[PDB]
Design a binder for this molecule. Sequence first.
Ligand SMILES: [K+]
Ligand SMILES: [K+]
Ligand SMILES: [K+]
Ligand code: NA
Ligand code: NA
Ligand code: NA
Ligand code: NA
Lengths: 131, 131, 158, 155
Amino acid sequence: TVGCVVVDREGRCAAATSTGGLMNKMTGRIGDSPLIGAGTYACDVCGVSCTGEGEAIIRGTLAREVAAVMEYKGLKLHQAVDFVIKHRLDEGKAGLIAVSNTGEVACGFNCNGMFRACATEDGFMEVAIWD
Amino acid sequence: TVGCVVVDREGRCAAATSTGGLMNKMTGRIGDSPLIGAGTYACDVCGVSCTGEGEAIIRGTLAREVAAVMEYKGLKLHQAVDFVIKHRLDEGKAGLIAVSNTGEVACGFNCNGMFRACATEDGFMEVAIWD
Amino acid sequence: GGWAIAVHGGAGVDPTLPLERQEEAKQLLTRCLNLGISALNSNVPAIDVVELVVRELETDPLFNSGRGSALTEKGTVEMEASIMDGPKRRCGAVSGLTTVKNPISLARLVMDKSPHSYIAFSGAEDFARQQGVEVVDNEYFVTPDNVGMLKLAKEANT
Amino acid sequence: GGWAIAVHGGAGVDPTLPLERQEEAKQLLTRCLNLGISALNSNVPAIDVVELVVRELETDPLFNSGRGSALTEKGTVEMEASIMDGPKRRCGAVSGLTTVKNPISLARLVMDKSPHSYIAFSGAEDFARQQGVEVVDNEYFVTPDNVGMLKLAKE
Ligand SMILES: [K+]
Ligand SMILES: [K+]
Ligand SMILES: [K+]
Ligand code: NA
Ligand code: NA
Ligand code: NA
Ligand code: NA
């Protein structure tokens, strides 16, 4: 699974996720990556791409959840990502990247590592695998 | 599209949706009915099945939204269904049926009609197509 | 509270619906509702009730699912369904079914018996046969009424 | 508040992943991030940026998408993707792709050019061809490394 989330200078957010799925999967098996609200979500306020255990991401509608917690609980991007990762996954192992329309970027994951890179116009730039 | 939502005496909710999809569709087209969070959702507090324009139900994660609004805005089932139908659907036309773990049952829709029937153990029963 | 149940046969009803079809639809909704109520009064778990009721809705040709499904442009049927059990948020879903008599029950088996939550098309047809569910020729699901409407939809597409 | 961008190449990485592979992965992430950064500096719309960046991730065989995808039990590849534009919550998704070089771009076309939001398997392959996107043999997507990993997966 690979993905990208972007907020542009106009404050528009977008999200994209692509995958080969699970190694040794039987034919016809569909994971969380192509499922809107699970692997991928964007709205007025954020763009989100998830990766990890398909089971957990699907059942928790994880990408939409970041947006719901911003919209309905009022949380800022970083809090919302923290909340979803820490309190909306239990069994499951997953990670996600997100942007807000205000130009913030966040990544969160509860497993060992996650390949990711983040940048903002103001010069923040980070590439990482572990925490 | 057809569907059923149930809460049993143990307070467990479940939801099921099945369809042939849109008439004259091309092979391979997938609508909202098989998509968790869009056509179908159930969790601790509700079970939901949706029906209508796939486009609107998917982008509005409509079945998950009933649950998200119960959880994050604290709305009870009837008002949560009201909220989702009113605020979550734009130009799109859809409806849904839902039950809560406390044994309430609700249906809401923004189009001309929706075939549904609802009942509770205390004896309420309704079969309706129109408002 | 105690038990509660709702059933549906789809939105998008035209206000000029003939009375006769309105009556058929209410009679079917009533039968399905009562089938679920009977199971609930017998202490059947919610997840089993939604499956048994959607199976009845699939089997009856009136609404758009199972036999009586809408047709593809090729004039055939491709069915899909999902099911979810709330207490542990267990999910199963299937798409692209062409021979499976009761799609919802195959979604149940994906939930209970697959490491995945969604199987579609050829792999879902394979899974149905591994699971031993009832399978039939696609023509089984196709009804005269739907052939009639497909014609109209096509020409209307100008 | 200015532009912002994140890319990822998947969660759950083996802790015994060698240094050289770590660097390779960071180098790919950086190349893809920089592609997106340049577009954002050129005022390219968010929706166009996510697609162009994910295309580069798909093309590179390192991560699990496009060429370099994990393999099914038959040792072949079946790809899937989705994309969403925030301002009007427009959606596109694809599954069951076996010949389409860049699945994310087919998801873009489902969003922009189909009445449906999701097309999969044979119908998605037909749609790819109606839209004239690049298609290739499935073997194109299979890399030696994944063949080896599948063998381990099957024990
Ligand atoms: K039916
Ligand atoms: K499972
Ligand atoms: K890749
Ligand atoms: Na039927
Ligand atoms: Na399963
Ligand atoms: Na690749
Ligand atoms: Na579209």
